[PDB]
Structures are given as C-alpha cells and as structure tokens.
C-alpha cells in the first residue's frame, strides 16, 4: 500500500519521524535495513510507562524460497500482505500497526 514504504532511510531518521508525540501508538513505516543488506525493517512507535515514547525495529527477512517474515513461523508472500496482517493482529509485535508515519 506504498505510503508506508519509506525505502532507504536510516534507523536515525525513522526514529526522528516516528517519535513525533502526535503519532498514535503503533504508527509505523517499512524501510530497507541499513545493516542487513537485502532485508527490510518494520519500525513502530510504542509506549512504555517508564520509557515513554520509543521505537521498536523488526527486521523483515526474505526466504530464498521467496517469502517475507519477521518470525519464522508466519511467512508472507509480499510486504503488503505482511502489513495488512500486522495491522489486524499484533501477534508477537509490541502493538498492532495503526497509522502510516506522515510524509
């Protein structure tokens, strides 16, 4: 669904964008991984009543057999199917995906 695909942005910049106080918990973006070539990253804003605003990063790996996954047991045939899925069920993530990060 493209608006949430931010491509080549750094971890630092994704955190700057996501840690905007006005974003609801579960605001997210998908970007390329800086450190693991060929992997993507799902970056999500989260709240802890201790840490407060913070961002969790979930590496999205590509199976050679083709699929995408964050945890081994749940694989997806595309990034857009993975985003639709975690927008409905948190299923291991800190929180379900809610808003697409602005811009």
């Amino acid at each position: 669904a493209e608006e949430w695909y931010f491509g080549k942005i750094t971890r630092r910049e994704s955190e700057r964008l996501l840690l905007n106080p006005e974003n609801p918990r579960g605001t997210f973006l998908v970007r390329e991984s800086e450190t693991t070539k060929g992997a993507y990253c799902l970056s999500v804003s989260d709240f802890d009543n201790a840490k407060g605003l913070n961002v969790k990063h979930y590496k999205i790996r590509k199976l050679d057999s083709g699929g995408f996954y964050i945890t081994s047991r749940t694989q997806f045939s595309s990034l857009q199917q993975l985003v639709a899925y975690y927008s409905k069920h948190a299923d291991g993530l800190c929180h379900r995906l809610t808003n697409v990060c602005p811009t």
């Binding site: 990253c41 969790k56 990063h57 979930y58 590496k59 964050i70 945890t71 081994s72 291991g92 800190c94």
Partner: peptide, 5 residues
Amino acid sequence: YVPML
C-alpha cells in the same frame, strides 16, 4: 532490532 526467532 527486537531479536525475533
């Protein structure tokens, strides 16, 4: 990154 298996 959250270390996920």
